[PDB]
Design a protein around this ligand. Structure first.
Ligand SMILES: CCC[C@@H](CC(=O)O)C(=O)C(=O)O
Ligand SMILES: CCC[C@@H](CC(=O)O)C(=O)C(=O)O
Ligand SMILES: [Zn+2]
Ligand SMILES: [Zn+2]
Lengths: 335, 335
């Protein structure tokens, strides 16, 4: 249920701001960084919302006005779409599938241009949607650098060490409009998802629900994204989606959600909730141990399936032939 | 159609001695060793019956009496079955499938014991069937050694050189009863199949008919054998068997059939034709070239599929899990 803001300022959100879907869920635990149960969840690669890390405490003051003045004059990737769904697609893989035409259009612009184009839309009441997704880099201004350095690196660096993870891969700056949705997908890296402004509903599915969520082929641009339209699921093509069960939570300013590697997640900025701001923290996972302990974990089987698809594309000399060969291998032999 | 024996001795066989099957066929070419078309077929890895190689000319005099006196006192593998079908099974793989109970029973016996047990069956009119399949080795007697040395090694050694094949792997001595059948299967080595006594109907299918013949899993004992009962094909499980087209021939004494590597073959000793004797010649194929030329040949795709199944069994730690994972990879993603 919804949490209550301090100072009797009422519920920060209410259930009417959540989109409706076909599957059940149960809540992700919301715990203190000092709670041993929170450490055991992260250790066991299960999601947990940490409420008091102060991970991005300096960034809680961030809003569009502050950022525009201080984030510098670098280029920012801004996506546009006529729908609320911002399906991610790999442009490098767009050669393998010349019949894929994305629904989101990426435009590279300056931050003040992003703010203005957002102002125009709001002014003219248009229905176009924007999502700014840009990796933080050197080009940011001095005050953002100061904020960045003020993150709680003491806490997250200990997490990185305790879990044996690799190095910090990148921080993504995410600024979306109310109602924006990132469809279900999984990432190959560990993720601390640090909410700054507004509220995001996060729905996670463990890696052992691969069978229910039907990722695209590895060579398709939407590799790692679910083929299922959560708003109109085709149960004839995706029958096991009827068995999908999620882990759900709403993160607000100051919350950090641990999204373990290979865990599916569906992320939506609450309806009529204003703009949302997030910074994520992506780390390479721990190295695979020399002695493989059976039985394998679900995410290890996912990794095997990915490797098979990759190698089959290399060996055949064309990713389009992967499907036919795989069918030939199984029809009447393993099904 | 049937060939006519020299000396006006009538047709060596007639169509009534062939079992009836559901698929069409067209004849394998019967050519002279000196015919350039025969060399081009072997070069292109297509089957051909060579009528005049003299490959096993010294062995044409072989019969049971001669062999019993001279083949020595080594052990011979003799298979028994209540059916005409002698389905091959790998005993080393019988651990992976503890629910597989073979229909053929292997007994290790002396050659005179093989002749006697065959005599008893004939005497009592029993319906039990035997198939002697034993690799020729050092234990054979002096007269068999003389015959073996008299094979046409000049011709076959040139074939081995011209085609870049590996070394001779083994010679199999095959002695079966009339009506005996070796069900459809493919071998990973090149094969010159040298008929000595009696007649065998050989039905071959190219490697690109993998989809129609439904081999067992690689880890099953019947790896490389077809799952289709040629006498009662289950078209619900094996629908593409209705599209199978074979290459057919009957080999007699003095014929040599080139069975290219990975080509399916179904071999049956003609009905009411007496005992059959064959010696085959298995060679490792040429090495795979460093630069892979696309498009791939059919047998290369078969090799890829085999390797995937093998690696998936190693990686998962259990061959029984290969099927489930492969299904998970494809359901709703590549089909
Ligand atoms: C562009 C990726 C951002 C994010 C989802 C979101 O907040 O809309 C996500 O999927 C992740 O941090 O892994
Ligand atoms: C045991 C294998 C013998 C042979 C078939 C047969 O003559 O019954 C075959 O399949 C081959 O030479 O490859
Ligand atoms: Zn993600
Ligand atoms: Zn064979």
């Amino acid at each position: 249920e919804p949490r209550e803001e301090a100072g009797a300022l009422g519920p920060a959100w209410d259930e009417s701001q959540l989109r409706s879907y076909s599957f059940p869920t149960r809540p992700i635990p919301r715990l203190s960084q000092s709670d041993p149960r929170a450490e055991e969840l992260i250790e066991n690669e299960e999601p947990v919302v940490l409420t008091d890390t102060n991970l991005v405490y300096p960034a809680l003051k961030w809003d569009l006005e502050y950022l525009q003045e201080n984030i510098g004059n670098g280029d920012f990737s801004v996506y546009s779409a006529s729908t609320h769904k911002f399906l991610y697609y790999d442009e490098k893989k767009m050669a393998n599938f010349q019949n894929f035409k994305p629904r989101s259009n990426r435009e590279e612009m300056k931050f003040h241009e992003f703010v203005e184009k957002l102002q125009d839309i709001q002014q003219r009441g248009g229905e176009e949607r924007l999502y700014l997704q840009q990796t933080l880099n050197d080009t940011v201004g001095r005050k953002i650098v100061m904020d960045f350095l003020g993150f709680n690196w003491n806490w997250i660096n200990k997490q990185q060490g305790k879990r044996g993870w690799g190095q910090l891969t990148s921080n993504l700056l995410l600024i979306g409009m109310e109602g924006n949705v990132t469809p279900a997908h999984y990432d190959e890296q560990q993720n601390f998802f640090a909410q700054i402004k507004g509220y995001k509903r996060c729905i996670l599915f463990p890696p052992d629900q691969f069978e229910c969520l039907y990722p695209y082929p590895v060579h398709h641009p939407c590799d790692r994204q679910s083929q299922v339209d959560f708003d109109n699921p085709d149960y004839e093509r995706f029958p096991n989606f009827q068995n999908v069960v999620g882990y759900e939570t709403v993160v607000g300013p100051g919350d950090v959600l641990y999204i373990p590697m290979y865990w599916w997640h569906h992320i939506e900025s609450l309806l009529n909730g204003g703009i949302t701001i997030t910074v994520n923290f992506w780390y390479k996972g721990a190295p695979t141990p020399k002695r493989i302990e059976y039985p394998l974990k679900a995410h290890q089987k996912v990794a095997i399936m990915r490797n098979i698809e990759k190698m089959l594309g290399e060996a055949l000399g064309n990713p389009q032939e992967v499907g036919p060969l795989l069918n030939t291998m199984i029809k009447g032999r393993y099904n």
